[PDB]
Amino acid sequence: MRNRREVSKLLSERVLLLDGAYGTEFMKYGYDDLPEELNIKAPDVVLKVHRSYIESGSDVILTNTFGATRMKLRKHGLEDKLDPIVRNAVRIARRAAGEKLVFGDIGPTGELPYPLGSTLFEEFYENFRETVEIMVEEGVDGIIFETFSDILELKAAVLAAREVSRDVFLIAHMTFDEKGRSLTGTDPANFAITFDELDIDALGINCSLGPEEILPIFQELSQYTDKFLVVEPNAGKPIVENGKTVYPLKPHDFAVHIDSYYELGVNIFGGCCGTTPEHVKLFRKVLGNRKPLQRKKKRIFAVSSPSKLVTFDHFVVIGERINPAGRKKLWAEMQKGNEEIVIKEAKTQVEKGAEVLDVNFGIESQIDVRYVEKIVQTLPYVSNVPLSLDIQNVDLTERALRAYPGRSLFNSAKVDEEELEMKINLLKKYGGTLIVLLMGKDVPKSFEERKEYFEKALKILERHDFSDRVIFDPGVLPLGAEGKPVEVLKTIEFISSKGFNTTVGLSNLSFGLPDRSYYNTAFLVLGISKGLSSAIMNPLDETLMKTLNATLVILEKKE
Ligand SMILES: N[C@@H](CCS)C(=O)O
- Distance, in Å, from the CA atom of 52 to the CA atom of 46, rounded to the nearest integer, reads 10
61 pocket-lining for ligand 1 (C-beta < 6 Å)? no
Known binder of ligand: residue 468? no
Burial 42-60 (b: 16+ CB within 10 A, else e): bbebbbebbbbbbebbbbb
Known binder of ligand: residue 338? no
Known binder of ligand: residue 262? no
Q: Give CA separation, 419 vs 47, 81, 162, 319, 412, in Å.
A: 54, 46, 25, 25, 10
- Distance, in Å, from the CA atom of 120 to the CA atom of 139, rounded to the nearest integer, reads 30
- Distance, in Å, from the CA atom of 144 to the CA atom of 205, rounded to the nearest integer, reads 11
Contact 148, 182 (CB under 8 A): yes
Distance of CA 346 to the CA centre of its chain: 21
146 pocket-lining for ligand 1 (C-beta < 6 Å)? yes
Residue with CA nearest ligand 1 atom 7: 21
Contact 410, 399 (CB under 8 A): no
Tell which one of 60, 273, 279, 280 to mutate to probe ligand 1, the residue whose CB is within 8 A of the most ligand atoms: 273
CA of 275 to the centre of ligand 1 (A): 10
Contact 67, 109 (CB under 8 A): no
- Distance, in Å, from the CA atom of 222 to the CA atom of 230, rounded to the nearest integer, reads 10
- Distance, in Å, from the CA atom of 162 to the CA atom of 403, rounded to the nearest integer, reads 15
Q: Which helix (H) or strand (E) holds 333?
A: helix 328-335
- Distance, in Å, from the CA atom of 404 to the CA atom of 432, rounded to the nearest integer, reads 9
Q: Which ranges of 383-515 does DSSP label H, i.e. alpha helix?
A: 394-402, 417-430, 447-463, 485-497
**Which fold is adopted by the domain 2-300?**
TIM Barrel (3.20.20)
Q: With CA atoms as reference, report the closest residue to 274 among 177, 208, 205.
A: 208
Q: Name 206's bridge partners.
A: 232
Asked whether the domain spanning 301-559 has the same topology as the one spanning 2-300, the reply is yes
Half-sphere exposure of 401 (CA within 13 A, CB side): 27
Domain boundaries, the chain: 2-300, 301-559
What are the DSSP calls for 498-530, one per residue? TT--B--BGGGGTTTSTTHHHHHHHHHHHHHHT
- Distance, in Å, from the CA atom of 62 to the CA atom of 86, rounded to the nearest integer, reads 12
Tell which one of 25, 53, 64, 66 to mutate to probe ligand 1, the residue whose CB is within 8 A of the most ligand atoms: 66
Q: Is cis: bond before 115, omega within 30 of 0?
A: yes
Half-sphere exposure of 62 (CA within 13 A, CB side): 29
Torsion sign across C-alpha atoms 258, 263, 264, 266: positive
120 pocket-lining for ligand 1 (C-beta < 6 Å)? no
**Which fold is adopted by the domain 301-559?**
TIM Barrel (3.20.20)
Integer-rounded Cα radius of gyration of the chain: 26
DSSP state, 221?
Answer: H
- Distance, in Å, from the CA atom of 326 to the CA atom of 320, rounded to the nearest integer, reads 13
Q: Return the C-alpha torsion angle 464, 466, 470, 476, nearest 10.
A: 20
Give 217-222's long-range contacts (Cβ < 8 A, gap of 24+).
217/176, 217/180, 217/188, 218/188, 218/261, 218/264, 218/266, 219/264, 220/180, 220/187, 220/188, 220/189, 220/192, 221/188, 221/189, 221/191, 221/192, 222/264, 222/265, 222/295
Give the number of residues written for the chain.
559
CB within 8 Å of 460: residues ≥ 6 apart? 415, 417, 420, 421
- Distance, in Å, from the CA atom of 539 to the CA atom of 525, rounded to the nearest integer, reads 15
Q: Of ligand 1's atoms, which has the minimum distance to the CA of residue 22?
A: 7
Q: Which ranges of 141-291 does DSSP label H, i.e. alpha helix?
A: 151-164, 188-195, 211-224, 251-255, 258-263, 277-287
Q: With CA atoms as reference, report the closest residue to 356 among 346, 365, 366, 364.
A: 346
Q: With CA atoms as reference, report the closest residue to 410 among 418, 496, 400, 366.
A: 400
Contact 187, 180 (CB under 8 A): yes
CA angle in degrees (0–180, nearest 5) for 434-144-77: 110
Round to the nearest angstrom and report the end-to-end CA distance of the chain: 59
Known binder of ligand: residue 518? no
- Distance, in Å, from the CA atom of 428 to the CA atom of 522, rounded to the nearest integer, reads 37
- Distance, in Å, from the CA atom of 244 to the CA atom of 275, rounded to the nearest integer, reads 16
Contact 405, 305 (CB under 8 A): yes
CA of 272 to the centre of ligand 1 (A): 6
Angle, helices 328-335 vs 340-351, to 10°: value is 130
Strand pairing of 387-390 and 356-360?
A: parallel
- Distance, in Å, from the CA atom of 318 to the CA atom of 415, rounded to the nearest integer, reads 22
Backbone angles phi, psi at 307, to 5 degrees: -110, -5
147 pocket-lining for ligand 1 (C-beta < 6 Å)? yes
Half-sphere exposure of 85 (CA within 13 A, CB side): 26
Distance of CA 183 to the CA centre of its chain: 14
- Distance, in Å, from the CA atom of 513 to the CA atom of 520, rounded to the nearest integer, reads 11
3-state helix, strand, coil in the chain (%, to 5): 45, 15, 40
- Distance, in Å, from the CA atom of 522 to the CA atom of 547, rounded to the nearest integer, reads 9
Tell me the technique behind this structure. X-ray
- Distance, in Å, from the CA atom of 370 to the CA atom of 419, rounded to the nearest integer, reads 24
Burial 503-542 (b: 16+ CB within 10 A, else e): bbbbbbbbbeeeebbebbbebbbbbbebbbbbbbbbbbbe
96 pocket-lining for ligand 1 (C-beta < 6 Å)? no
* 3-class SS of residue 536: strand
Contact 354, 318 (CB under 8 A): yes
Nominal resolution in Å?
Answer: 1.7
CA angle in degrees (0–180, nearest 5) for 50-54-55: 115
- Distance, in Å, from the CA atom of 549 to the CA atom of 75, rounded to the nearest integer, reads 51
Residue with CA nearest ligand 1 atom 5: 147
> Residue 33 burial by CB count (10 A; 0-12/13-18/19+): exposed, middle or buried?
middle
103 pocket-lining for ligand 1 (C-beta < 6 Å)? no
Q: Name 85's bridge partners.
A: none
Distance of CA 379 to the CA centre of its chain: 16
CA of 66 to the centre of ligand 1 (A): 6
62 pocket-lining for ligand 1 (C-beta < 6 Å)? yes
Q: With CA atoms as reference, report the closest residue to 18 among 56, 49, 46, 47.
A: 56
**Number of other residues whose CB lies within 10 A of the CB of residue 105:** 27
CA of 146 to the centre of ligand 1 (A): 8
> Residue 306 burial by CB count (10 A; 0-12/13-18/19+): exposed, middle or buried?
buried
272 pocket-lining for ligand 1 (C-beta < 6 Å)? yes
Known binder of ligand: residue 23? yes
* 3-class SS of residue 95: helix
CB within 8 Å of 53: residues ≥ 6 apart? 19, 20, 61, 277, 280
Contact 280, 55 (CB under 8 A): no
479 pocket-lining for ligand 1 (C-beta < 6 Å)? no
Tell which one of 147, 230, 275 to mutate to probe ligand 1, the residue whose CB is within 8 A of the most ligand atoms: 147
- Distance, in Å, from the CA atom of 435 to the CA atom of 495, rounded to the nearest integer, reads 13
Residue with CA nearest ligand 1 atom 8: 23
- Distance, in Å, from the CA atom of 28 to the CA atom of 30, rounded to the nearest integer, reads 6
CB within 8 Å of 27: residues ≥ 6 apart? none
Angle, helices 121-138 vs 82-97, to 10°: value is 40
- Greatest C-alpha distance within the chain: 82
- Distance, in Å, from the CA atom of 458 to the CA atom of 542, rounded to the nearest integer, reads 37
Give the neighbor-by-neighbor strand order of the sheet with 60-62. 16-17, 268-269, 228-232, 202-206, 170-174, 142-148, 101-106, 60-62
Which residue type is seen at 136? V
Which residue type is seen at 507? S
CB within 8 Å of 363: residues ≥ 6 apart? none
25 pocket-lining for ligand 1 (C-beta < 6 Å)? no
Q: Of ligand 1's atoms, which has the minimum distance to the CA of residue 275?
A: 7
- Distance, in Å, from the CA atom of 32 to the CA atom of 25, rounded to the nearest integer, reads 9
Q: With CA atoms as reference, report the closest residue to 385 among 358, 412, 415.
A: 358
